[PDB]
DNA sequence: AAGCAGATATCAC
DNA sequence: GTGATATCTGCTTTGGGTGGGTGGGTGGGTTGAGGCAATA
């Protein structure tokens, strides 16, 4: 048989390559990555292109000249290097991913003299289809002998053997596929589109089909903006091909004989073996392990630090002067409590939520911008909605197929996160009824024309709203200044407010802070830990699940019969959890695993302040 | 919105005829005064590339005490006697005065800008603010969507009522 | 009517 | 006498409603009237 030089000395520097390239530790790279590759769930494997540019640069320029054609050798090279380790079925496939490509190209820049060599895009994701099995090699028994053939190639097409393997036998019309011994490898087709920087003034967007394969399949959501390594293809017009096995279904080239007296078009796809994204069953050990020793000492000494409720609070909100409360209550916000099951199913609610009351100009949205800026999972979002769906769901009518679906809202996208919502007392009816069972049930029910859901909304709501007359009147109480309905009022963990005070001291300091934000970007911000930092002690500390002790229980039943000795607003039992909930957040930052009696004093404290500036003037 | 103007029309008589005159010599313009303007465009053009494309203004210490001292008396005019003034404004001079330094193409924001965009906001807002009953000063129509003096007359008809 | 799949007789070497 | 290779024969096609809505609208067909959810 014909042996392509070519491809051979590719695949055997390719073995070398993986072999011998050493890190800066001094083992090989490699090696312990493809250690890893003796998981059933794991096929690929991960190459920088610039440690193969340093290896070997001829090797490389070959690489990215002849991708498509000599990717199968690769692939072979992986599988021998891979071959020595006993856990690896003979039958399993491996593929070769190339990471970090150092030229990018434009979408608009895939032409015909691209097809076949090794590429890197971006692109917005629009659409993902479901996967798919894809036959790679068929194994074929032969009806006249019963010989059976093996590693026949596919082309787009469904290809049967084209002369049977005896050479005794002339067969080339009757064959049989045995699904078994067939080789087959993950497909889905995604759709993407130009990203809004590279579209060019005023042009429609120019559109993309890519093709992800093993490992990479579901890997890209729409709407995400993502980088795609791999090469440019063409795919024929598979409906006017015609084989033995396959009939035709119903300008270009014509004359092959499979063509009749049809014809054949092209149309271009990408064939990405690399996805990433272009911008990019915990426990505390587990946590503890993700980090690297420099960072676990620093989480340590943060746990250590006896000023840490104030220097977390100053860290989180450094452009904002003032209000200290309301500081120390997102920050409790945003350590949580312990959400629990009972012994009959049903769940007691863990998360926080809290609520700003603010004159016009009063840094309410500087509140909500730091939260949303700093947490991972968050959602910034309006009481006053764009969509239909709201800061809950909506049911919208597909036109084309008449059916039924759900347009998820704001707290559900916020799910397991925080959910920022400004203007929050604009909220329309529909999401004001819903917003009950949202709050405290953590759930929204539908049973409307074609659905019937249940759909989950574990979220902390912080939440900012102005004052019904649009100036806060310190003789009312803040029922009276607000339109917020008891039953919603009483879902709230912590109120807070911020009163325009007509101060020149005040005024010169709120002056002062933001000109030198302005005048010193960089300068102005001092923390004493920064956000990544926080970041990490935040993940550390939700890890926790302090118990409450007997004392706590003790002043916690105290706290809460005088509470109500004291006082349509009332005390009820959601005032109790709350206390609870609070109790255990300020035990859970300290990454401490009892409440002390000391955390239920200081969340009594707030809450106390909480209640008596809901009732009095 | 940094800046809300109001274009009224006037009663005048003697605005009629100066814009009566405009329009007609313009109905009557020639054309190389409109190759003329067309040139003054492109020029416009290329300056507002150019400003984009090198210069980036930042506030000197003098400027910063401007502002600073500018926002405090904005506020001082309504504790006088109600609120004239809202931090958010502060920010909006910012913007104005830096604004400024780059039509000069100059890297440093001076008290001229300022002066120039406290001067060009207090225009505005004397265009814009206005209560058509008693005065100015009052800016809680924008913050709060009522006229302060609605909402004392709207106070006392509740009171009323509730007599 | 138009064209591919299958069957089969037929030239040529 | 075997390997092409030229001739002959039978299948089914078309989009279509006598080929079904107990095939399915991700296999593809204007226009109007009729329920929904969100709407005002
Ligand atoms: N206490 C404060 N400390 C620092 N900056 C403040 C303070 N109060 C207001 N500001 C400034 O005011 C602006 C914040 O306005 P923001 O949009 O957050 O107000 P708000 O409370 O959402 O009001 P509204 O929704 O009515 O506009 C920023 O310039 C912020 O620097
Ligand atoms: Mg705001
Ligand atoms: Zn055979």
């Given at each position: 048989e014909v042996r392509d030089e070519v491809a051979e000395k590719c695949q055997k520097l390719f073995l070398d390559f993986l072999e011998e390239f050493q890190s800066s530790d001094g083992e090989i790279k490699y090696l312990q990555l493809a250690e890893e590759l003796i998981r059933p769930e794991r096929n690929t494997l991960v190459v920088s292109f610039v440690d193969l540019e340093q290896f070997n640069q001829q090797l490389s320029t070959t690489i990215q000249e002849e991708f498509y054609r000599v990717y199968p050798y690769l692939c072979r090279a992986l599988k021998t290097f891979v071959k020595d380790r006993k856990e690896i079925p003979l039958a399993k496939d491996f593929y070769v991913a190339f990471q970090d490509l150092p030229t990018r190209h434009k979408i608009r820049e895939l032409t015909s003299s691209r097809i076949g060599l090794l590429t890197r895009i971006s692109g917005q994701v629009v659409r993902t289809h479901p996967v798919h099995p894809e036959l790679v090699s068929?194994?074929?028994?032969?009806?006249?002998?019963?010989?059976?053939?093996?590693?026949?190639?596919?082309?787009?097409?469904?290809?049967?053997?084209?002369?049977?393997?005896?050479?005794?036998?002339?067969?080339?019309?009757?064959?049989?596929?045995?699904?078994n011994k067939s080789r087959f490898v993950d497909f889905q087709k995604v759709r993407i589109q130009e990203t809004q920087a590279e579209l060019p003034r005023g042009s429609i967007p120019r559109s993309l089909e890519v093709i992800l394969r093993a490992e990479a399949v579901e890997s890209a959501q729409?709407?995400?903006?993502?980088?795609?390594?791999?090469?440019?293809?063409?795919?024929?017009?598979?409906?006017?091909?015609?084989?033995?096995?396959?009939?035709?279904?119903?300008?270009?080239?014509?004359?092959?004989?499979?063509?009749?007296?049809?014809?054949?078009?092209?149309?271009?796809?990408?064939?990405?073996?690399?996805?990433?994204?272009?911008?990019?069953?915990?426990?505390?050990?587990?946590?503890?392990?993700?980090?690297?020793?420099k960072e676990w000492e620093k989480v340590f000494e943060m746990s250590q630090d006896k000023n840490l409720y104030h220097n977390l609070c100053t860290s989180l909100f450094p452009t904002i002067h003032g209000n200290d409360e309301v500081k120390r209550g997102v920050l409790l916000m945003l350590f949580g409590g312990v959400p629990k099951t009972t012994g009959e199913g049903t769940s007691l609610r863990g998360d926080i939520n809290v609520c700003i009351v603010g004159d016009p100009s009063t840094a309410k949205s500087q509140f909500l911008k730091h939260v949303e800026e700093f947490s991972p999972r968050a959602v910034y979002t309006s009481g006053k909605a764009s969509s239909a769906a709201g800061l809950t769901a909506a049911v919208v009518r597909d036109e084309e197929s008449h059916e039924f679906v759900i347009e998820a809202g704001a707290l559900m996208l916020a799910d397991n996160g925080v959910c920022c919502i400004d203007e929050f007392d604009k909220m329309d009816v529909r999401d004001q009824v819903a917003i009950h069972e949202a709050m405290e049930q953590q759930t929204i029910s539908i049973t409307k024309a074609g659905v019937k859901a249940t759909l989950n909304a574990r979220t902390s709501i912080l939440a900012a709203a102005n004052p019904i007359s649009g100036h806060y009147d310190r003789s009312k109480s803040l029922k009276q200044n607000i339109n917020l309905s008891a039953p919603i009022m009483s879902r709230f963990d912590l109120f807070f407010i911020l009163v325009d005070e007509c101060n020149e001291v005040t005024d010169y300091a709120i002056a002062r802070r933001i000109v030198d934000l302005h005048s010193r970007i960089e300068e102005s911000i001092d923390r004493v830990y920064s956000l990544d930092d926080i970041r990490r002690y935040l993940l550390f500390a939700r890890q926790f699940k302090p118990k409450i002790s007997k004392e706590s229980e003790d002043f916690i039943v105290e706290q809460y019969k005088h509470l109500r000795q004291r006082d349509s607003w009332r005390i009820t039992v959601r005032q109790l959890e709350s206390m609870i909930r609070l109790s255990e957040a300020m035990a859970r930052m300290h990454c401490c695993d009892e409440v002390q009696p000391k955390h239920v004093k200081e969340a009594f404290r707030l809450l106390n302040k909480s209640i008596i500036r809901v009732e009095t003037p | 919105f940094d800046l809300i103007f109001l274009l009224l029309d006037p009663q005048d008589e003697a605005y009629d005829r100066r814009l009566a005159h405009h329009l007609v010599a313009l109905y009557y313009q020639s054309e190389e005064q409109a190759e003329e303007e067309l040139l003054d465009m492109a020029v416009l053009k290329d300056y507002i590339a150019y400003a984009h494309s090198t210069i980036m203004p930042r506030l000197s210490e003098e400027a910063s005490q401007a502002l600073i001292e500018a926002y405090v008396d904005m506020r001082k005019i309504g504790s006088s006697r109600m609120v004239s003034a809202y931090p958010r404004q502060l920010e909006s001079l910012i913007r104005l005065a830096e604004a400024h330094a780059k039509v000069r193409l100059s890297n440093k924001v001076e008290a001229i800008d300022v002066e120039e965009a406290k001067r060009l906001?207090?225009?505005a807002l004397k265009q814009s603010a206005t209560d058509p009953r008693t005065g100015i000063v009052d800016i809680s129509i924008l913050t709060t969507g009522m006229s302060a003096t609605s909402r004392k007359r709207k106070e006392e008809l509740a009171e009323a009522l509730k007599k």
């Open positions: 068929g194994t074929f028994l032969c009806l006249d002998c019963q010989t059976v053939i093996r590693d026949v190639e596919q082309q787009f097409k469904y290809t049967q053997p084209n002369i049977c393997r005896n050479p005794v036998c002339a067969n080339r019309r009757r064959f049989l596929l045995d699904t729409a709407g995400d903006k993502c980088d795609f390594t791999g090469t440019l293809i063409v795919v024929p017009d598979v409906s006017k091909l015609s084989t033995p096995g396959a009939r035709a279904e119903t300008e270009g080239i014509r004359g092959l004989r499979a063509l009749g007296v049809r014809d054949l078009s092209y149309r271009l796809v990408f064939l990405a073996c690399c996805v990433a994204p272009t911008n990019p069953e915990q426990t505390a050990e587990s946590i503890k392990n993700q980090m690297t020793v | 906001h207090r225009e």
